[PDB]
Amino acid sequence: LEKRPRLVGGDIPCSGRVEVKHGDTWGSVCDSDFSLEAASVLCRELQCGTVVSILGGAHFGEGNGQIWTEEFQCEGHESHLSLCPVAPRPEGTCSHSRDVGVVCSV
């Protein structure tokens, strides 16, 4: 399950707050750290098609625990977030009020 995505707090299927498994935590992702490329990989990986909207600012609620401290530097084509290049991030630059969300289609 490591670096697998889920979407939680969404009203309809294939939408919600982004959470990506990191050890024993389903970690949220700061909107600032996210990208259309990573959102594309997430929608693909979740069998949810393509990105329609990226919503920042904890639109679908706030996560809890460790916010991701690596950035998913996806090229955009990858089948899995686990296959994207990553970069280390400094801790504490975002709160959960910036947890990113995605709406996928198909």
Author numbering: 1 to 4, 478 to 578, 1001
Quote the authors verbatim:
Infection by its etiological agent, PRRS virus (PRRSV), shows a highly restricted tropism of host cells and has been demonstrated to be mediated by an essential scavenger receptor (SR) CD163. CD163 fifth SR cysteine-rich domain (SRCR5) is further proven to play a crucial role during viral infection. In the current study, we prepared recombinant monkey CD163 (moCD163) SRCR5 and human CD163-like homolog (hCD163L1) SRCR8, and determined their crystal structures. After comparison with the previously reported crystal structure of porcine CD163 (pCD163) SRCR5, these structures showed almost identical structural folds but significantly different surface electrostatic potentials.
In this work, we prepared recombinant moCD163 SRCR5 in Pichia pastoris X-33 and hCD163L1 SRCR8 in Drosophila melanogaster Schneider 2 (S2) cells, respectively. The recombinant moCD163 SRCR5 and hCD163L1 SRCR8 were eluted as monomer during purification. Their crystal structures were determined and refined to 1.58 Å in P1 space group and 2.0 Å in C2 space group, respectively. MoCD163 SRCR5 was comprised of two antiparallel β-sheets (β1-4, β7 and β5-6) and three helices (a single α-helix α2 and two 310-helices α1, α3), whereas hCD163L1 SRCR8 contained two antiparallel β-sheets (β1-4, β7 and β5-6) and two helices (a single α-helix α1 and a 310-helix α2). A close comparison of moCD163 SRCR5 or hCD163L1 SRCR8 with pCD163 SRCR5 revealed that they shared almost identical structural folds (RMSD = 0.355 Å for 79 matching Cα atoms between moCD163 SRCR5 and pCD163 SRCR5, RMSD = 0.249 Å for 95 matching Cα atoms between hCD163L1 SRCR8 and pCD163 SRCR5). The minor differences between moCD163 SRCR5 and pCD163 SRCR5 were only observed in the long loop regions. MoCD163 SRCR5 displayed a similar surface electrostatic potential as pCD163 SRCR5 did, so-called “D/E-R-rich” charge distribution. The comparison provided a structural basis to explain why stable expression of moCD163 rendered comparable infectivity to PRRSV as pCD163 did, since their crucial SRCR5 shared the overall conformations and surface electrostatic potentials.
